[PDB]
Structure 1
Amino acid sequence: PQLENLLCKVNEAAPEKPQDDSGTAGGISSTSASVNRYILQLAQEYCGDCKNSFDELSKIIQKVFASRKELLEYDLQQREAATKSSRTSVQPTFTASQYRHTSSTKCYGCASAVTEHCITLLRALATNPALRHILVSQGLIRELFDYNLRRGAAAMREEVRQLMCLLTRDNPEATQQMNDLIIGKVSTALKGHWANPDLASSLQYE
């Protein structure tokens, strides 16, 4: 909730004049002191406190997983020993039965990693002209424009832009669609530039 709240304040982007608090125990340089207090508060709350708590939780989760694995192995050995006069030739399920290294569902992180893998695979496929036309017919350009253009690491964003450029190579219908999308977005952002200065965030990318 604290991060939820500090983020709200930071989004307001208020120019609260520098507050020179009497307490100077922390070594805050003029530039850092002039940084938005909420920004610094967010950085301390998430990178400091949330990261420390998450590291502690991950260590505890790994130790719990190791304990569960040892207990399960002991139970497997005991039931196998108690299953005398009965032998099942397991194959190749030995893996499925005991090893049981997998990403939990709804994991923003590894979900974004899978998205990056999808971008890499699509950049590979788009090279083949027939595959490129098929992907354009699927509707890949609009998906990449709406979702993958603005999210991910900057290298991933540039890879998405290259993928779209590849999809629109020597393809009048494809290039036309991307151009129409860009024109629409740019004209909408020109219909409120004075009203709302969020034009720089998207129009720049387009």
Structure 2
Amino acid sequence: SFDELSKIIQKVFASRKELLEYDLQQREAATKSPTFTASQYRALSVLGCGHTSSTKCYGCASAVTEHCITLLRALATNPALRHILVSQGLIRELFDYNLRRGAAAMREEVRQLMCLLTRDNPEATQQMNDLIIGKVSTALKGHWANPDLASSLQYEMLLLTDSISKE
């Protein structure tokens, strides 16, 4: 159903573009019987029409989150930028949201970024350790009445392993 919908939507878009181009040409012909700069021509014409994503799109938001993770990983290699980022409160945001969401590669990249953010900062390391210990203790308190609590700590323990493995 999605494939048929996409085909029909593309056909409709092509038809709309052709119709609007013809209307613009006819209007210009009627008017010829105003200078535009190079950027204004692109803005007005049909050239800048079909490269914008929908506002409520899951895939596009996922892609933007991937780009944000990549850019933040690049930025964190500067110690001053690392300090500013950890002062923004990025560690808790990455812990609550991006640890468990996305492809496996993205999850490992988020783990690497979280490890890098605490490379030589005792306060950031203490904060991350507090988050991990709190989650593990809260899960282990009710593990006995619900085993999924004990079996849904793999990412916290993986984060601990990754942080320790980097001397």
The normalised TM-score by structure 1 is 0.66
When you count helix as a share of all residues, which structure comes out higher?
2
Contact 1:73 1:98 in 2 (8 A): no
Paired with 1:95 and 1:151, the residues of 2 have a C-alpha distance of: 45
Deviation at 1:79, TM superposition (A): 1.2
**Total equivalences in the alignment:** 148
| Cα 1:200/1:80, change in 2 over 3 Å | farther
State the distance in 1 between where 2:131 and 2:34 align: 51
Per-residue CA deviation, residues 147-179 of structure 1 (Å, 9 max, x unaligned), is 000000100000000000010110111111111
1:199 to partner: Cα distance: 2.3
Distance in 2 (alpha carbons) for counterparts of 1:194 and 1:57: 49
- Aligned partners of 1:116 and 1:156 also within 8 Å: yes
1:97 aligns with 39
Q: Are the equivalent residues in 1 in contact too, given 2:140–2:150 (CA < 8 A)?
A: no
RMSD: 3.5
- Distance in 1 (CA, whole Å) between partners of 2:35 and 2:141 is 62
- Cα distance in 1, alignment partners of residues 35 and 88 from structure 2: 38
Cα 1:83–1:93 shift into 2, 3 Å: closer
Deviations 1:47-86 (A, max 9, x none): xxxxxx11111111111111111111111111111221xx
Percent of aligned pairs with the same amino acid:
99
Q: CA separation in 1, counterparts of 2:114 and 2:37?
A: 41
Displacement after TM superposition at 1:197 (Å): 2.0
**Greater length-normalized contact order (CA 8 Å, ≥ 6 residues apart):** 2
Moved over 3 A (4+): 91-100
**Structure 1, unaligned runs of 5 or more:** 1-52, 85-90
1:16-47: per-residue Cα shift (whole Å, max 9, x none)? xxxxxxxxxxxxxxxxxxxxxxxxxxxxxxxx
The equivalent residue for 2:110 is: 160
Distance 1:150 1:117, change over 3 A: same
